[PDB]
Short mmCIF file of C-alpha atoms in Angstrom, two decimals:
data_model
loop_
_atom_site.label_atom_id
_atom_site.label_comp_id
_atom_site.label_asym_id
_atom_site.label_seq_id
_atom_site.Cartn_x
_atom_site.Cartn_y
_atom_site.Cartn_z
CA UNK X 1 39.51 65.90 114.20
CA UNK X 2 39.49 67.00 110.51
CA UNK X 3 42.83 66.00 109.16
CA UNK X 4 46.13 67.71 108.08
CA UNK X 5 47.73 66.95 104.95
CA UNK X 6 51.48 64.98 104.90
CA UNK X 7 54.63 66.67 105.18
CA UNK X 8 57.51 66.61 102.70
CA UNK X 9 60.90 67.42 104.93
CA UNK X 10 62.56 70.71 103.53
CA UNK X 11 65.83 69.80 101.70
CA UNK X 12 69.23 69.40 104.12
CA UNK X 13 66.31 68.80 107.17
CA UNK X 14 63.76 67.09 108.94
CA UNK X 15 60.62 67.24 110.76
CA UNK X 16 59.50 66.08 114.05
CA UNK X 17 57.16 64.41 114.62
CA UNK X 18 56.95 62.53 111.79
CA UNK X 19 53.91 60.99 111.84
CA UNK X 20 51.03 58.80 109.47
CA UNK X 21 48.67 60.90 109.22
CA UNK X 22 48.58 64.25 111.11
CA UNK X 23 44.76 65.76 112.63
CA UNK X 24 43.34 68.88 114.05
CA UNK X 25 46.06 70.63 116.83
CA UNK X 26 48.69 68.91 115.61
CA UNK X 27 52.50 70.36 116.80
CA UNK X 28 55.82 69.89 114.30
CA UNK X 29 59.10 71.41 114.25
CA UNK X 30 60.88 71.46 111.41
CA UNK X 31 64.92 71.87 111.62
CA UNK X 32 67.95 71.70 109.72
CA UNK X 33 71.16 69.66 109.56
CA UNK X 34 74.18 70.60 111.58
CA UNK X 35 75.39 73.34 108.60
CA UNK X 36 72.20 74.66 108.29
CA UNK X 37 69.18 77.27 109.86
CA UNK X 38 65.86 77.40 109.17
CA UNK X 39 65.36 80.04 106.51
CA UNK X 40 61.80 81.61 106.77
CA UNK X 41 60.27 85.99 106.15
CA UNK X 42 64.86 86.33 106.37
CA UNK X 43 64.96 85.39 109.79
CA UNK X 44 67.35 82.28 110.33
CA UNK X 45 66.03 79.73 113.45
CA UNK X 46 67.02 76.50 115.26
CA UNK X 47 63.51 75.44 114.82
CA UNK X 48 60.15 76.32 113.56
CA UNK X 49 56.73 75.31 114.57
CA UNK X 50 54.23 74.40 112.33
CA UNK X 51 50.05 73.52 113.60
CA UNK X 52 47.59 71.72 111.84
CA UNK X 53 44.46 73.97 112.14
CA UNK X 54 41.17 73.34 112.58
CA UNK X 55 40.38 73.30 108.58
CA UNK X 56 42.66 71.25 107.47
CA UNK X 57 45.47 73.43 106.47
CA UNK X 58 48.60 73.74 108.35
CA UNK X 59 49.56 77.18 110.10
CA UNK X 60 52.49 77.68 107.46
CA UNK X 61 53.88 76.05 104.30
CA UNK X 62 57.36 73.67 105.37
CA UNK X 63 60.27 76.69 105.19
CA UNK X 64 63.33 75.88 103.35
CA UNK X 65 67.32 75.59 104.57
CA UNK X 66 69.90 77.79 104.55
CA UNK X 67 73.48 76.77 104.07
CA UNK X 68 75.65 78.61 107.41
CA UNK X 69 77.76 81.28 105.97
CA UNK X 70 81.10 82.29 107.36
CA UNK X 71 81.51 85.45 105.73
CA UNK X 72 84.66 86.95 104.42
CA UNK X 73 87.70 85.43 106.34
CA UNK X 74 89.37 87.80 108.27
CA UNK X 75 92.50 89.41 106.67
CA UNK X 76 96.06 88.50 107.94
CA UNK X 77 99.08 90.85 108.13
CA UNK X 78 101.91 90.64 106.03
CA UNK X 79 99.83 87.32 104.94
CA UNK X 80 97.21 86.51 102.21
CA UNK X 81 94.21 83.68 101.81
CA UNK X 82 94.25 81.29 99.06
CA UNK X 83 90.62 79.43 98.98
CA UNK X 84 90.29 75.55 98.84
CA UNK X 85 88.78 75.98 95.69
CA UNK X 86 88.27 78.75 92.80
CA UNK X 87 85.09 79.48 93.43
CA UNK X 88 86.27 80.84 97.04
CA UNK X 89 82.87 79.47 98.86
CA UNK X 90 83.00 81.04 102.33
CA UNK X 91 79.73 78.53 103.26
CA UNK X 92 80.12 75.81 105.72
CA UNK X 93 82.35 72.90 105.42
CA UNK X 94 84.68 75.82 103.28
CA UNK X 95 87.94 75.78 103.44
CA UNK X 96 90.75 78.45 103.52
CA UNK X 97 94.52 78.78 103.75
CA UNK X 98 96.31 81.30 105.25
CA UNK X 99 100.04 81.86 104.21
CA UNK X 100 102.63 84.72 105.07
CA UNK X 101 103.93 87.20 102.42
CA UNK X 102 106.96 85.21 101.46
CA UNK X 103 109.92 85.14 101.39
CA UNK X 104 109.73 88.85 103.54
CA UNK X 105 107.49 87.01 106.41
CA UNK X 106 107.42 83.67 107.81
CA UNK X 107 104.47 82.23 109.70
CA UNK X 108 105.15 80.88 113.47
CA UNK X 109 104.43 77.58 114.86
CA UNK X 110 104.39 76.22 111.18
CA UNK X 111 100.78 76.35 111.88
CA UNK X 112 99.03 74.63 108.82
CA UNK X 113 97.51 77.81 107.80
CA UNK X 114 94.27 75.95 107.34
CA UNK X 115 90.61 77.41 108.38
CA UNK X 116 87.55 75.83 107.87
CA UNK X 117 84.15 76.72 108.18
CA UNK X 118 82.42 75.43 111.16
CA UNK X 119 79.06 74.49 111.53
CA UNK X 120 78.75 77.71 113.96
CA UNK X 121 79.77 79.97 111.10
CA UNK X 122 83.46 80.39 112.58
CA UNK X 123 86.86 80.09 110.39
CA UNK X 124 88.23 77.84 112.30
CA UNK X 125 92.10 76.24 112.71
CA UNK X 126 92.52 72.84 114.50
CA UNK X 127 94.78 74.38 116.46
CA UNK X 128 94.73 78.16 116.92
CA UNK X 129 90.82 78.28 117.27
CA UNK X 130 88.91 81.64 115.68
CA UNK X 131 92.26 82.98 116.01
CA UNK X 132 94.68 83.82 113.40
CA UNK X 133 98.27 82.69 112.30
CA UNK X 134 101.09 85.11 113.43
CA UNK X 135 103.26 86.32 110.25
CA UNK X 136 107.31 87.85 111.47
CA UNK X 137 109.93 89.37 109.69
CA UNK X 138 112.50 87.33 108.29
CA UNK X 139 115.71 88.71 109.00
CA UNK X 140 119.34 88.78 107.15
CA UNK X 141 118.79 86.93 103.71
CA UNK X 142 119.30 89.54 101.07
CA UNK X 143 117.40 88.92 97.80
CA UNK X 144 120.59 89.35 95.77
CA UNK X 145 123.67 87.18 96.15
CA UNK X 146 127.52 88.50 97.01
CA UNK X 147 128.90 89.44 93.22
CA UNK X 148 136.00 98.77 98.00
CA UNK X 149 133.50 97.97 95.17
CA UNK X 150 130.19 99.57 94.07
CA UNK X 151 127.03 97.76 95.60
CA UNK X 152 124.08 96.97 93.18
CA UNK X 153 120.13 97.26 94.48
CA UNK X 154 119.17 94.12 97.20
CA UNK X 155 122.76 93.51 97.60
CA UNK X 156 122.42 95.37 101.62
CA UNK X 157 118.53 95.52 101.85
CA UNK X 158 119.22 96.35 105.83
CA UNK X 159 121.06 99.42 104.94
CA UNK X 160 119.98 102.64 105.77
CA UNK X 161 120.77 106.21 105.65
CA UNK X 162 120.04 109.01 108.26
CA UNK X 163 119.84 112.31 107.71
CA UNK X 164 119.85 115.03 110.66
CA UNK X 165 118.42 118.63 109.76
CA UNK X 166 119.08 120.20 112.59
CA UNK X 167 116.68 123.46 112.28
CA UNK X 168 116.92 124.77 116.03
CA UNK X 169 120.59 125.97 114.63
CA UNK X 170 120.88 129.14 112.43
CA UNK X 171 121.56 127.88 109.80
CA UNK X 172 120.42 124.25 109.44
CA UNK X 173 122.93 121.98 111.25
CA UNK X 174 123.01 119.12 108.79
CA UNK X 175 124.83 115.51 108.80
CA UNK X 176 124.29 111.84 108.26
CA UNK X 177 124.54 108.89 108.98
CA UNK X 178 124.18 104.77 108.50
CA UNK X 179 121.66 102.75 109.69
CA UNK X 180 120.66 98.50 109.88
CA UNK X 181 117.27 97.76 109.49
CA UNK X 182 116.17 95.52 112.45
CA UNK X 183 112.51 95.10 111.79
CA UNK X 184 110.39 97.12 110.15
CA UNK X 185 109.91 100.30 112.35
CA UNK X 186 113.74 100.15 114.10
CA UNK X 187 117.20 101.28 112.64
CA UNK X 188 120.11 100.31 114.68
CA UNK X 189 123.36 102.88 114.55
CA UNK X 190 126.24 104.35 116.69
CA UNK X 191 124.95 106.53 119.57
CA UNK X 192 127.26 109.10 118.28
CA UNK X 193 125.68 109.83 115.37
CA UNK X 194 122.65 110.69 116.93
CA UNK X 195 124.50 113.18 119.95
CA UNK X 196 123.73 116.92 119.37
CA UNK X 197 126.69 118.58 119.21
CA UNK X 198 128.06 121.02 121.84
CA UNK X 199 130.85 122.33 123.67
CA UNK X 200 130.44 120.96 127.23
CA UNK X 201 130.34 116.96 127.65
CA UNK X 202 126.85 116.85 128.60
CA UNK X 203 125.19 113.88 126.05
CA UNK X 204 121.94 114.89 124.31
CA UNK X 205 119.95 112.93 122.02
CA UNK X 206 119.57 115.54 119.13
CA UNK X 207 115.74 115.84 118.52
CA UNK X 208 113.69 113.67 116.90
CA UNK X 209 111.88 115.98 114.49
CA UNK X 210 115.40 116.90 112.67
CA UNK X 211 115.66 112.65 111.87
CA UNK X 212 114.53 111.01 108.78
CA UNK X 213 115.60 107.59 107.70
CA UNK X 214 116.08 106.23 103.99
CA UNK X 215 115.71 102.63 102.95
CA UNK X 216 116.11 100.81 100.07
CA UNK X 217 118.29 103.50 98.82
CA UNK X 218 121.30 103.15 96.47
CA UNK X 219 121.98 106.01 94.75
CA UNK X 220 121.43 109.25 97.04
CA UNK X 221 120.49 111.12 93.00
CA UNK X 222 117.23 108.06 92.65
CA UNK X 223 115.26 108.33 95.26
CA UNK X 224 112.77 106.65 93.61
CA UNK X 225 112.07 102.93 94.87
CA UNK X 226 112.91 104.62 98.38
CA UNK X 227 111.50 104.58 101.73
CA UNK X 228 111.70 107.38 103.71
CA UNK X 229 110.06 107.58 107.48
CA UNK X 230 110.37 110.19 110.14
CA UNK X 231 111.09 109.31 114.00
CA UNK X 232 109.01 108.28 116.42
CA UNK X 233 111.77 107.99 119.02
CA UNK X 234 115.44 108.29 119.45
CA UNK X 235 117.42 106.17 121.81
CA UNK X 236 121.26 106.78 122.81
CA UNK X 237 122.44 103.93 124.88
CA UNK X 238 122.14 105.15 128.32
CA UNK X 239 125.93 104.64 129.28
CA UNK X 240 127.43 106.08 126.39
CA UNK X 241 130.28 108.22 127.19
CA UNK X 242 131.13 111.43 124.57
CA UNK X 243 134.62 111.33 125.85
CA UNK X 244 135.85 108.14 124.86
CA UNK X 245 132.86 106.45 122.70
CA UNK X 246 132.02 104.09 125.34
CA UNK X 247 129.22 102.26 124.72
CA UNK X 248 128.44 103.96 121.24
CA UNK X 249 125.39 102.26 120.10
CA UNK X 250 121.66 103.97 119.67
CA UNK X 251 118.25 102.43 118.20
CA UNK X 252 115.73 105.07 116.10
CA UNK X 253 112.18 104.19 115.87
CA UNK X 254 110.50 104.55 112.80
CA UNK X 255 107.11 106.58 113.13
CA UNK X 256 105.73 104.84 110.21
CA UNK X 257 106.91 101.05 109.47
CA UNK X 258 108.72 100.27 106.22
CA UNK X 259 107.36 97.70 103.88
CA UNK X 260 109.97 95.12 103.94
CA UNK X 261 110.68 94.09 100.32
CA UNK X 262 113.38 93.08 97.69
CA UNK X 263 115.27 96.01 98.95
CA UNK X 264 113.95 96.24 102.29
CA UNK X 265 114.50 93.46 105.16
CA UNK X 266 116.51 93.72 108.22
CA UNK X 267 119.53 92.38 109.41
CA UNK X 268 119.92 89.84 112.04
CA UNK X 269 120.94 90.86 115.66
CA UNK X 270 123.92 88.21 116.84
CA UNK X 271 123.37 86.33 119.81
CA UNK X 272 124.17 86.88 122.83
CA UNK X 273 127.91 86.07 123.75
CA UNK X 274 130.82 87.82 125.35
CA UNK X 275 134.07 87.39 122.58
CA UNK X 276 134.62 89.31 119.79
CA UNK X 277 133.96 88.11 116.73
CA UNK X 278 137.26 85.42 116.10
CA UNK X 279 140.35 87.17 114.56
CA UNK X 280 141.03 86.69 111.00
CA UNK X 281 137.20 86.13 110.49
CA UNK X 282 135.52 88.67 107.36
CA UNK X 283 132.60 90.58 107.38
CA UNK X 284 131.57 93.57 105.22
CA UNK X 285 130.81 97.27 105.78
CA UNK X 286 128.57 99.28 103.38
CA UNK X 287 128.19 103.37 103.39
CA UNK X 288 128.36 106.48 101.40
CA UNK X 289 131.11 107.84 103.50
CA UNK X 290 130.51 111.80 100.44
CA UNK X 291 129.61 109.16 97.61
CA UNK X 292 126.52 109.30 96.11
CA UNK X 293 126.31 105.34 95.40
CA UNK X 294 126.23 102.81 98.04
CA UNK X 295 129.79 100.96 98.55
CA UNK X 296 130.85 97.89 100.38
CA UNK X 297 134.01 96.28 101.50
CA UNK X 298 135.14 92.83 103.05
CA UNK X 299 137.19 93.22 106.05
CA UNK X 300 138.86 90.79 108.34
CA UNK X 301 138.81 91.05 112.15
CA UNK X 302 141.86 92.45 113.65
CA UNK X 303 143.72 90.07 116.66
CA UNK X 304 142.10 92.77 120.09
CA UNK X 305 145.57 93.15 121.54
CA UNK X 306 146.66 94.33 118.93
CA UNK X 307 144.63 96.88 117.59
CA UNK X 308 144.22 97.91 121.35
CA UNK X 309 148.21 98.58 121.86
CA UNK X 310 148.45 100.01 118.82
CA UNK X 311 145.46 102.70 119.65
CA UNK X 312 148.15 103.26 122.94
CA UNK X 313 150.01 105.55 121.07
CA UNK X 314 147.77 108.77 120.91
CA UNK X 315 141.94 106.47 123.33
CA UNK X 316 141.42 103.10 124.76
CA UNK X 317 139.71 100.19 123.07
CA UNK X 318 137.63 98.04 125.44
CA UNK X 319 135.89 94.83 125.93
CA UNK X 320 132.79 96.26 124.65
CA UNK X 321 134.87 97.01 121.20
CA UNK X 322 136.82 94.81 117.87
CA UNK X 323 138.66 95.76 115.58
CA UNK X 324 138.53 95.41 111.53
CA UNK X 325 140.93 96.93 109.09
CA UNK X 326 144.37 95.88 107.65
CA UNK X 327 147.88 96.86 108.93
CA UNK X 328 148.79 99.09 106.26
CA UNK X 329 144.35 101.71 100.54
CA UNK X 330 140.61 102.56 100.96
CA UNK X 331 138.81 100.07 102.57
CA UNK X 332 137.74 102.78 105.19
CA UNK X 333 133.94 103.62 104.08
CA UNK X 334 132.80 104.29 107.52
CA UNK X 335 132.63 107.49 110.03
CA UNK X 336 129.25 106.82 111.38
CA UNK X 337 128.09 103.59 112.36
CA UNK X 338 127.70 101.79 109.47
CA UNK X 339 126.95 97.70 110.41
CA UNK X 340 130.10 95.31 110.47
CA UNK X 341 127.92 92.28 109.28
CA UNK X 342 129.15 88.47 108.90
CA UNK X 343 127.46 85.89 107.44
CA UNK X 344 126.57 83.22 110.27
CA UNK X 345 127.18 79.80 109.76
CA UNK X 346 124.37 77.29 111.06
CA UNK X 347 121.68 79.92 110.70
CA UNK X 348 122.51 80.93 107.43
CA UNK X 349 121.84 84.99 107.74
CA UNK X 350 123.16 87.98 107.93
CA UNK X 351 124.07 89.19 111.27
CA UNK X 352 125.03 92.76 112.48
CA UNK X 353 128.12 91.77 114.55
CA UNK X 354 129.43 95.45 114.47
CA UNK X 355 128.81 99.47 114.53
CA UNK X 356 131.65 101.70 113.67
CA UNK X 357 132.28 103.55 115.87
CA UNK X 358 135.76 105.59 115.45
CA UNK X 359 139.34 105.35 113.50
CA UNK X 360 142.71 106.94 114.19
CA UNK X 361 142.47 110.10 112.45
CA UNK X 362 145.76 109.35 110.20
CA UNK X 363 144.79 108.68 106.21
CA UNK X 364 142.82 105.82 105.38
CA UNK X 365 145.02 102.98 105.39
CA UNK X 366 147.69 104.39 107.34
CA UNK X 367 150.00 102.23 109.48
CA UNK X 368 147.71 100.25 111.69
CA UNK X 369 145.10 102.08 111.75
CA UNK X 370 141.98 99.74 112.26
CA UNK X 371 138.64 100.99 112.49
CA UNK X 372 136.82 99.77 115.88
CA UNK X 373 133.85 98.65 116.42
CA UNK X 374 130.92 98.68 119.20
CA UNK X 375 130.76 95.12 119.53
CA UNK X 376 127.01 94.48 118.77
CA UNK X 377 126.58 90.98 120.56
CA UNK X 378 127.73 93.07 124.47
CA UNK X 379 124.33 94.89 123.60
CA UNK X 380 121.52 92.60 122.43
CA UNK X 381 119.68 92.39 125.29
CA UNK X 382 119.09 96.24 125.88
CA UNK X 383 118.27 96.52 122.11
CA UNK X 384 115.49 93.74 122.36
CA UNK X 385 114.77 95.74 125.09
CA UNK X 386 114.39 98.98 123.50
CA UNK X 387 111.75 97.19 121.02
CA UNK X 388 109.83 95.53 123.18
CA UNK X 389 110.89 91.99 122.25
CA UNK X 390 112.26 91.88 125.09
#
């Protein structure tokens, strides 16, 4: 049998079988290392099969290696890829990080963040697989630090504004409101800003098409650096009562998302326990309410028997309600559910312990005349609810 020349092993593989001396009918396969396909006419293969003919001369030349490529990682949301290395290979044995938009989102599980590519041209994580990291929303740390005064831009990054155009009306029905930011597509708020107006006591969401929120806004005159989305949905709490603001609390979804920046993030919702915040404690209250700037005040939370007896005197503030305010000029910024917030202490965020809800109708600072609040931690679970969370 007239014999077949030798065979030099294509770079990154080898041959089999390697033989001597190789003669007429003579089988090989030729195959790559583990990152690695045989390359040959743009067709990748496990294997490839080489015969030494009759003349002398093999069937085909030895074919070369190709390197396994993992393509272009797979985007993240809210996240971002930093490659191993500048020259961002995306070949096997590659590796990628994946990190969270910071300090907006945060990624769960700590996972490492780390992909590599596999020898089956797959990003892969050690732990979550082919699958990617999950980036959230961080909630209640405001990008500006605490400096009834004038608030400056990042100062309440939660805060919102609602406006209602109601059109069905002749003319235009128009009023607004305050809303917290909760994550990016939900505004939390007082049910009774969102109740249409009539003259029986029947409680209707007003429509959804006359809502659109603001976020990011300071200065009702520069809308610029503003947010503004319509409303997917509108949610009154199902028990709240027109008569005597019972259960006056109300989500809006947003029908498209906010991009949560320096002036953008949402508040915190409070956990979930019965008491009112403790007496004595401070939180602040931002609105409009009429100005055309943002304003804030620190208020201290009013002893409940107290403010409740004193409402005795004409409705009736209950269990579901606190009070903020002091006994006796105008620290009274809030008709329409602005957020009562406090800064929590472990966690270290900004949590939405309050909605305003109503006020004695006596001047602003009157004689005991706190403002109450729907207490925000009685409602929690419904408003994870609401969202989906659950």
């Amino acid at each position: 049998g007239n014999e077949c020349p030798e065979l030099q092993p294509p770079v990154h593989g080898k041959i089999e079988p390697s033989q001597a001396k190789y003669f007429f009918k003579d089988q090989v396969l030729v195959s790559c290392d583990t990152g690695y396909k045989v390359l040959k006419d743009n067709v990748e293969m496990d294997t490839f099969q080489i015969e030494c003919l009759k003349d002398g001369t093999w069937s085909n030349k030895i074919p070369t290696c190709k390197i396994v490529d993992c393509r272009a990682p797979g985007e993240l949301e809210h996240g971002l890829i930093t490659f191993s290395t500048r020259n961002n290979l995306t070949t096997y044995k590659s590796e990628i990080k994946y990190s969270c938009q910071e300090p907006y989102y945060k990624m769960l599980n700590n996972n490492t963040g780390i992909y590599t590519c596999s020898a089956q041209g797959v990003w892969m994580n050690k732990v979550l697989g082919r699958s990617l990291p999950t980036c959230l929303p961080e909630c209640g740390q405001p990008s500006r630090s605490l400096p009834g005064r004038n608030a400056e831009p990042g100062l309440f990054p939660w805060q919102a504004l609602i406006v209602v155009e109601d059109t069905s009306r002749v003319p235009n029905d128009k009023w607004f409101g305050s809303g917290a930011l909760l994550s990016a597509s939900w505004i939390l708020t007082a049910a009774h800003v969102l109740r249409s107006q009539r003259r029986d006591t029947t409680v209707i969401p007003v429509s959804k098409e006359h809502v659109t929120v603001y976020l990011g806004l300071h200065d009702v005159r520069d809308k610029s650096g503003a947010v503004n989305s319509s409303a997917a949905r509108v949610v009154l709490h199902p028990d709240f009562n027109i008569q005597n603001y019972n259960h006056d609390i109300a989500l809006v979804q947003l029908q498209e998302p906010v991009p949560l920046g320096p002036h953008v993030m949402p508040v915190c919702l409070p956990r979930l326990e019965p008491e009112g915040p403790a007496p004595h404690m401070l939180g602040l209250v931002a609105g409009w309410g009429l100005s055309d700037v943002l304003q804030y005040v620190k208020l201290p939370v009013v002893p409940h028997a107290e403010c409740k007896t004193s409402y005795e005197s004409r409705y009736s503030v209950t269990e579901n309600m606190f009070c903020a305010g002091y006994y006796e000029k105008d620290t009274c910024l809030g008709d329409s559910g602005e957020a009562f917030v406090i800064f929590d202490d472990l966690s270290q965020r900004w949590v939405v312990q309050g909605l305003v809800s109503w006020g004695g109708p006596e001047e602003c600072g009157s004689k005991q005349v706190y403002g109450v609040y729907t207490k925000v931690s009685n409602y929690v679970d419904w408003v994870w609810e609401q969202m989906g969370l659950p």
